[model samples]
Target: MPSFDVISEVDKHELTNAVDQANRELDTRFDFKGVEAKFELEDGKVINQSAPSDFQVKQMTDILRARLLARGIDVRCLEFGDVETNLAGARQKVTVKQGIEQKQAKQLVAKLKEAKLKVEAQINGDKLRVTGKKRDDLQDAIAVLKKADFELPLQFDNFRD
Candidate 1:
């Protein structure tokens, strides 16, 4: 089957690299002796909790943002929700979707078809399966999808001849 799977997934190793960078920053850079801060990856979700003031929060966020870039993790892969803080502490949740949602999959399939390429697209769970007669068509479809600015990064995987 000459086909390609359009999946959305981040490199777990790169994510770990980001986490390590965060830990390094907390230990060396930020001078928070007894500050209560935490960063974790639970089931592909990022947990960022901290205390103190906005100053600390800046250091916190900057550390994360800078580290993410250090590993070249696509910004579209992780999006932080609105910053919510309280007297208790500062908490932020980062959400990253590895695959296309239902509506987005439909949109993607449509885009590939409308590209005037000889390809067929079908939604497989959270991903899209694109099959074509030749590798050229597959590459063409990839180009079409890559041109659009998707809310999340789309990972190209499971290519088969």
Candidate 2:
């Protein structure tokens, strides 16, 4: 049997480097000159603080998104915390979303079955697994899954014969 696992995981090193580059850009940019801004990664959380303005905050978030994308990090799973303000200005927390919840895992299993292919899918803890009699079917199923959307980023791994 051919098998593979569907999981939600992030490469922490890539993530860190991406955020660090974004911070460097924010620091050196002409527009950011004289503007008080700080972006840091602590405990898998990207802490952002900047001037209290809607455009600045949005721009900061967008810049970080682009940096992550450049490093092949999918920004879809970013969970933005509530925006707060201090005597200085605004701050927000960003964290990579994790886990395949039971609901989503069930949805994936159901979607796999609905593909009407020769496959068996089951949720295992925080991830899901799919096994089929042929590698071609497995690949096709993965394609179908890639077309689906979820609230979190999904990764497919561990192909085996």
Candidate 3:
């Protein structure tokens, strides 16, 4: 049997490291030389950032996004929250999405069915198990998944023969 599990995940440590570098970059940027801006990592997964203005906060988000990419993290998994404003400054929360939800698993299974490939896709909790009688079929299935944009970083894991 040729099979693999489709899952969405992130490396917490890498995410934290990206946030750190983004913060350091913010410190070095001339525009932010005297501006108040910072990134805070909470629960090892969530990022809370604040800046003196909404535009600065948006810039910080882009900086964090670039750093995440440099750290080999898929930007698709980073969910940026809406910018909030207060008298003192603006703030935003960045959530790292992990694991496919049941709804997404159903969608994936449906997608595989729509492809009409000789493969079986089953929703297994927060992940999808795709299996085929032939390795080539499995490979084709993977290609189809890669071509589809699920708005989440999908990884194939636990491939078994």
Candidate 4:
């Protein structure tokens, strides 16, 4: 028997490094110099704030994505949230998904269960572990999941036999 788990995860250390690199790049770029672009990582979430416009915010995000990529981290792991104008009227704020939230995990488990697959799902820290009795069953489960829209990025790994 073999099984696989679908989970969303990111390395905290790598993410921190990416933020630092993005900040450094912002400081050196002529158009962004003194623009007050700030990137912070708190509790596995990346918070980005930039002065006054969507373009500036997007520029910062692009730099952050590039930095993460250069650090050998997949950009797919970082999902951006909606942009909101801050109360101060001088900045815009955005949050990046650090890992899969518990709600999403539960939804995944429910979906698997609904498919009538005999699988066990457990939340192991930031990742989920799914175990089942057969490889073909696991494969069928994957196929069923792929046919639906999850809206969030999902990765399947840690196959065990």
Output the number of the TM-score-best candidate. Answer: 3
Quote model 1's TM-score: 0.85
Per-model TM-score, in order, reads: 0.85, 0.87, 0.94, 0.68
lDDT of 3 at 46: 84
Candidate 1 lDDT over residue span 118-140, tens digit each: 99999989889999999988989
Predictions ranked by TM-score, top down?
Answer: 3, 2, 1, 4
Looking at model 4, residue 8 earns an lDDT score of 60
The predictions' CA RMSDs to the true structure, in order, are 2.2, 2.0, 1.2, 3.6
User: Between 2 and 4, whose lDDT is larger?
Assistant: 2
**lDDT (10s digit) by residue, model 4, range 43-155:** 66755555556778877778877898898776765656667676542444445564567887788888888877877777866677777787777777777766766755566
lDDT of 3 by residue, 47-111 (tens): 89899899998888889889999999999987888999999999999888888898888888888
Name model 4 segments beyond 4 Å from true.
52-54, 72-89, 98-102, 113-127, 143-148, 157-161
Model 1, global lDDT: 0.77
For candidate 3, list the clashing residue pairs, or say none.
none
Per-residue lDDT of 10-127 in model 2, one digit per residue for the tens? 7888888888898898888887887877678878755454556656777899888988889887788788887777676777888777668798898888877777878899888888
lDDT of each: 0.77, 0.81, 0.89, 0.72
User: Stretches of candidate 2 above 4 Å error?
Assistant: 45-50
Cα-based RMSD of candidate 2? 2.0
